[model samples]
Target chain A: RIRGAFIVFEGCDRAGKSLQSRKLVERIKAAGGDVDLISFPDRSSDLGKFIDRYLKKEVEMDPKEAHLVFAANRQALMPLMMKKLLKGTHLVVDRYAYSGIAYTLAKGADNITMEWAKLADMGELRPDCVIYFNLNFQGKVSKVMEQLADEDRDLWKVVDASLTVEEISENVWNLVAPILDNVSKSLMFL
Target chain B: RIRGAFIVFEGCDRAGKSLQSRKLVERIKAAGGDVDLISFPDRSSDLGKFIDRYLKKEVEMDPKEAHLVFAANRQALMPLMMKKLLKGTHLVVDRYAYSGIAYTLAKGADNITMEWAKLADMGELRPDCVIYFNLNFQGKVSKVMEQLADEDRDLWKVVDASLTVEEISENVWNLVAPILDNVSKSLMFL
Candidate 1:
């Protein structure tokens, strides 16, 4: 059977990826389609719990090490995510590898280079569609994403984060809807 | 200035890597050399704590994700380790990337290949010397080490784990002594 469309919303935290992902899931379900919403730094898992603490400043961690933990959080979920997709359950992901890489690169640490961060997340499941909330204003995260977007041009859809909630959701759905019907038969990975 | 020697002990848990590491640290101290003892999955750090819990079966983790955590454990200590070594203090490490790769390879997970595990730990500080306790009797962990030993023959010194503690210690020291005074000027990595 053809797998579900792996849709990911990626940008900085405030870019409305989270909101749009939820709306997409709700829209998909209300239309009688099978879908589930997932997010990166999935704070529910054990590794993710540490990431939550790290985010809250309740824990101390080396920047590079924290990057690995974040990557581990995604790795921890790969099996389940792949299983769901292969089982034909569409997934609306709030964030994925792009966010992980962009944010780490934004840190600008000498030791934590772009190549190094990408290596940590090597071999992860590739998203069928990445609806990036490209912020109108530039920042380190958005800046780093340029390369990733260029590298995976075929898989990414650039949407303006400045748009209204409904407008952005509609834009995302337009990109997501087509893929659901034409889901790929074989799994692709980074 | 010449950095201190990067000495690592590798093998399974039952092997004498830990005991020999401690003994080597003591011997260095008694001989008036600058030295420090460190081990991977450094249990004191936050990432290490999770690794410890996972090892004790108190936590659930995907095998590949757990491997990333182990690699992160080593990455977390890199800065401090590099500083100490550059400050001319020798480090006796109980385990390093070899153990991380070997143990994960032993799991024999199809997705968690040797290449995948190595990528997670790419650019980690390379040990100047790896004294592998080649268990005369084979196990999953040791069996995996054969390829690693062959791949980096010059970096690895195979010792008999079946030998007496003193004999093995002497054998380890013989290999370690030459490198102590002839330390390299630049750092190396995997």
Candidate 2:
């Protein structure tokens, strides 16, 4: 069976990660392939609604607690998400663990160590492609992400969010193209 | 300056871990010390509610997905929880990362590797004393916890859960007393 590739777009708010994710998936569909979209801080589940509450200031929480809740929201969707991959349905995710780490780190707590950021999201199926939209951040917050990221460096492409819509889609498609091609070829045989 | 210790009791579901945790806290409080208790699948949090749902069969989810939510529930509590330790107030935990891994592994999946289990619970504080109730498991789950535990093995005592609750509590206190004394003396200096 042909396995689908997971593509994740990670960046700060207004960094255009979501727009680009939708654009990419639409492009994939146009190419006569199956694809689906997902996002973290997913407002779909009850756990996610709590995340929504935190984001909207409807509730107050410690930074660490907020971070864990964000990770849990992703977990709530993970298995069903992975099922799409196994069936050769490509997944285009708007935000994921990277954001869970970045935004939480941005919250600033003395003990919000990198080890803490990574621990809550363990056992997740890794993405086949990651397009990191490197936007501006408050000092120390972004710095911590740099010091702590044990991310798979090989698969990550860091961009400054300066690319135009057209160029951004191209860059994203380039990242997913080879993986999609591999899946495409596999689909033929399977 | 003395820092308070974090003690975790981990074992199978019916094992004496929680009972021993409560027993130890009472002992600490009675000894002119302060202590508190926390547990996993903290059904209080919205994130934990999802886990509660999964366990009660109110919701269907992928095992891997459910496992990550369980870990997230802990992360949400971590930063605030660590404060007690930094302030020289010992915290007694009834089940934690080890159980997160054990119970999830116990659920069974070919892809639920040890590395996957350990990754999610990263970045949280490590325990100063681990009172592991070694009740054993079907096979892989228990063995996985043993092999993949990043716990400070130096302070971990894997007692057979066959012991009476009184004996278990004593065994746990025995593990923490030295650490407690170390902290108490440090408190005097600080």
Candidate 3:
């Protein structure tokens, strides 16, 4: 049985990961695949919404500490997300561990090492592919985007932020196309 | 002006710190100085209530990771607690950092270290005194009452849990007795 593929979109703010995550979900559904999507700092659950408030600066927290809040939110959703994967459903998630680590480290919190951030995500399911959005491939704006690829883990694809909406979405399409068919084929015998 | 002495009660389950914290507050108030109290995992605000859910096993998280949820609830109170203390109101807290560190480590979570737990509490309001209740100091049931006594800071008192209600209260009274007059002196001057 082919378990569902887990695809995560992670990036710095304004890299357009959120939009593309949804677009990919929609595109997959249009392809007649059984699929679902979720965005991190979920803004739905109590903790998710707390992360949103943190992002909005309504709630203040130490950078390293705030990163754990983000992990906790996902950890709360772990069983459900993991369940769906076991049941052979494709899941597209907007953000996950990589985003948590990158942003927390970006703050240059002397007390928080990259190892520490990664450790927070110890048991969560790894994604099959992580499509990272970079607002620019190379330039001054690209500087901030440079921090995310931690070599920590992932079948990660870095998407250029310069591409048009259609181009970017189409680009990610190639990454997931094989994954989409893999599930599509498995579902027949599944 | 004499700042309010910040008092925290730290202990494990069944340690009876919560009731004592309130009783202490009552005793202080009867002594004619303004006083108030708050308990950790407040189970009121979104984060606090989320910690409640975590404890009941309705939510799942790594022990150290879940401690941050507990920390988030207390951290949310930092600014208000700080304000109340600065105004010279004696404030009793049901639980604080020590509990956060000890409980998480009790689970034997190798991935979560003491350093991680302490850092999660960075920038929080440090208490003037931390009254820790050890249900059994050194006896048959004395086991498991260990967590929190950061040599790094503050007036920390470890209270014997075997004391009678009145006896324990009296023991904590000495720790705060000095601050008891500081506020009284500032009030007379004011």
- Candidate 2 iRMSD in angstroms: 3.5
Give the alpha carbon lDDT tens digit for every residue of A122-163 in model 1. Answer: 888988888889883248888888788988789988998898
lDDT of 2: 0.71
Candidate 3 ranges with C-alpha deviation above 4 Å:
A1-8, A11-68, A74-93, A97-159, A169-190, B136-147, B150-154, B181-190
User: Which candidate do you rate higher for lDDT, 1 or 3?
Assistant: 1
CA lDDT of each prediction against the hidden true structure? 0.85, 0.71, 0.69
Candidate with more favorable, higher lDDT: 1 or 2: 1
Docking class of 2: acceptable
Q: After superposition, how far is residue B186 of candidate 3 from its true place, in Å?
A: 16
TM-score of 2: 0.72
lDDT of 2 by residue, B8-104 (tens): 7876667766677788889999998878898887888665665688778877655665666676677778766766777778888888887788877
Q: Best candidate per lDDT, number?
A: 1
**Per-prediction DockQ:** 0.79, 0.32, 0.15
Provide the TM-score, chain A, model 2. Answer: 0.87
Indicate the residue-level lDDT of B68 in model 1: 84
